[PDB]
């Protein structure tokens, strides 16, 4: 997983069937000051109900969505020292 922040969404009409009825969020990886980086954006199939500005936990290939990159957790606290 990686810590990331939801920064937008994508509206796609012509797409495959494995993606019907799901959200497509822009997911920006954020650095060790909890600040988004540059040129680090992926598209993730939301899975738990995340929205804008929320810090989420985006998982790589396999999450049964089947190998789409999905969001698997909404993060409350990041204790780091």
């Amino acid at each position: 997983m990686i810590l990331a922040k939801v920064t937008g969404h994508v509206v796609a009409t012509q797409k495959c069937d494995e993606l019907r009825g799901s959200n497509l969020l822009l997911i920006t990886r954020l650095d060790d000051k909890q600040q988004p980086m540059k040129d680090q954006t992926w598209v993730a199939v939301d899975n738990v109900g995340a929205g804008m500005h929320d810090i989420v936990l985006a998982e790589e290939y396999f999450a049964l969505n089947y190998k789409a990159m999905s969001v698997v957790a909404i993060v409350e606290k990041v204790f780091r020292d």
Partner: protein, 81 residues
Amino acid sequence: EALGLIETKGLVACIEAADAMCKAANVELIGYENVGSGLVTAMVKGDVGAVNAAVDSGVEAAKRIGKVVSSRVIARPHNDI
């Protein structure tokens, strides 16, 4: 602008549906209208690519935790409506 409708049995299933709709695309939520017998309906409006994406998302989320009775997208609604 287009117009999407989801009809659910019970109010809780309708707030889950309306939450998934409002996060899935850039649509504005108009409001609820219950007609009795436990049927509650949520109505959104926006561009037809967004409204189509929202209604498909809202149906799958409300289906998970309640009964979805009916759904519908009206691409060009009449001005009398």
